Amino acid sequence: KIPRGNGPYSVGCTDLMFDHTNKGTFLRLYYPSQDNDRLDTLWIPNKEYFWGLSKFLGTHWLMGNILRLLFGSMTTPANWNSPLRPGEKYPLVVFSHGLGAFRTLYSAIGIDLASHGFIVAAVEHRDRSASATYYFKDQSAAEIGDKSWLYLRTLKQEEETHIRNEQVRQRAKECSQALSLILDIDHGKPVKNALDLKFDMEQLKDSIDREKIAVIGHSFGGATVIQTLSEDQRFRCGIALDAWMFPLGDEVYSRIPQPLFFINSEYFQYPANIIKMKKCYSPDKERKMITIRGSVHQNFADFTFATGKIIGHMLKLKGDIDSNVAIDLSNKASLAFLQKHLGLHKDFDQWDCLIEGDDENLIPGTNINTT
Numbered sequence: 523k524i525p526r527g528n529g530p531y532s533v534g535c536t537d538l539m540f541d542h543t544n545k546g547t548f549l550r551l552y553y554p555s556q557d558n559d560r561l562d563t564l565w566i567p568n569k570e571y572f573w574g575l576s577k578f579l580g581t582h583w584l585m586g587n588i589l590r591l592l593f594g595s596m597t598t599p600a601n602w603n604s605p606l607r608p609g610e611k612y613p614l615v616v617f618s619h620g621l622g623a624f625r626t627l628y629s630a631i632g633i634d635l636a637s638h639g640f641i642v643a644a645v646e647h648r649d650r651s652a653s654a655t656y657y658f659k660d661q662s663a664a665e666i667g668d669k670s671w672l673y674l675r676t677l678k679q680e681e682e683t684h685i686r687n688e689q690v691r692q693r694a695k696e697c698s699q700a701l702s703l704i705l706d707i708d709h710g711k712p713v714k715n716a717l718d719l720k721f722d723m724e725q726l727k728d729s730i731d732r733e734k735i736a737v738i739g740h741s742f743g744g745a746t747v748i749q750t751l752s753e754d755q756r757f758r759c760g761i762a763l764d765a766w767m768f769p770l771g772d773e774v775y776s777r778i779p780q781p782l783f784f785i786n787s788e789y790f791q792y793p794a795n796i797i798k799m800k801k802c803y804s805p806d807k808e809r810k811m812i813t814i815r816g817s818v819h820q821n822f823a824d825f826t827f828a829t830g831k832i833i834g835h836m837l838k839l840k841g842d843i844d845s846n847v848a849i850d851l852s853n854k855a856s857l858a859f860l861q862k863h864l865g866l867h868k869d870f871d872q873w874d875c876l877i878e879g880d881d882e883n884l885i886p887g888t889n890i891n892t893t
């Protein structure tokens with residue numbers, strides 16, 4: 523089980539694709555919901571995501587079929603297509619997934635943020651960093667639901683620097699484009715969802731606290747946070763969850779005026795990566811860094827709740843720390859950070875001490891020595 527949100531709001535979930543092309547926005551929306559008696563949300567909704575997952579893990583696509591057998595009916599505790607909770611303007615998080623992931627795989631984060639009164643737009647990237655994604659070749663294909671699938675691209679050694687940087691820049695553009703889509707919907711601009719789903723986008727009219735915008739992401743998505751902030755000032759702060767810094771250009775590091783929070787796992791980080799995080803620091807800039815004790819890279823993803831403790835530890839989906847304990851720390855410290863830098867009038871400041879790494883299961887800053 524993916525945990526339910528800890529906040530007071532019920533959580534809805536829907537998908538939005540606009541336009542229908544490989545250049546349009548595809549996102550999964552998590553939102554405060556009016557109702558709590560809908561069907562739970564299908565975690566991985568299409569067989570082709572399992573094929574892409576199997577390719578990314580370096581197995582035969584038939585292991586994809588076995589993963590589908592084991593996980594294809596798994597749900598996440600968000601009310602599918604629930605009406606939006608009316609009568610409040612919600613701050614907006616745009617969320618960026620890791621390499622091999624896609625929009626649906628950070629629901630523990632998305633649901634928790636929504637349960638505290640956020641709208642969350644979890645982007646599906648079309649940079650070939652997702653294990654799979656889909657779109658429609660044209661308007662006829664969209665109408666009949668004839669999906670075109672795009673699978674993870676594997677790189678040769680000498681494509682690494684260049685293609686990862688091309689990908690992070692496309693990812694930033696996709697985050698900006700998703701923001702603009704949501705902001706235009708918030709006006710009441712008619713948008714016809716390329717997916718035929720029983721959620722009226724007209725509900726989102728006048729629902730966004732238009733100045734309270736953040737970008738959050740894991741791993742590749744953590745780099746995407748930083749790229750996005752340097753190029754789109756509409757984002758007011760960023761949270762990089764165990765950022766993989768390698769994709770970022772040399773130019774970005776001095777170009778991030780917004781507050782930035784690094785939440786790291788203990789066992790992923792390494793000096794080359796920490797050195798790159800430290801390049802984002804300047805005395806005029808607001809920077810914070812914490813490390814979750816006993817955690818691994820995938821503690822931020824829903825894969826951490828998908829198996830038992832032994833299989834979990836074996837597959838590096840779980841660390842020595844309990845997965846619920848770890849995600850609570852990351853989500854609560856995130857809430858306090860967003861309250862501070864978005865200027866929210868909630869009670870998230872109760873977790874301010876977590877921003878400083880002041881907890882038995884937190885390391886202030888980093889465990890990694892860079893000398």
Ligand SMILES: Cc1ccccc1-c1cc(C(=O)c2nccs2)ccc1C
Nearest residue numbers: 575578589593621622623820825828837
């Ligand atoms: C746990 C799980 C459930 C359903 C499909 C795939 C997985 C899986 C996932 C990873 C993983 O670490 C990642 N996959 C994509 C991005 S990270 C490693 C092993 C397994 C079995």
Ligand SMILES: [Cl-]
Nearest residue numbers: 792793794795
């Ligand atoms: Cl290193």
Ligand SMILES: [Cl-]
Nearest residue numbers: 789790818819
């Ligand atoms: Cl790790």
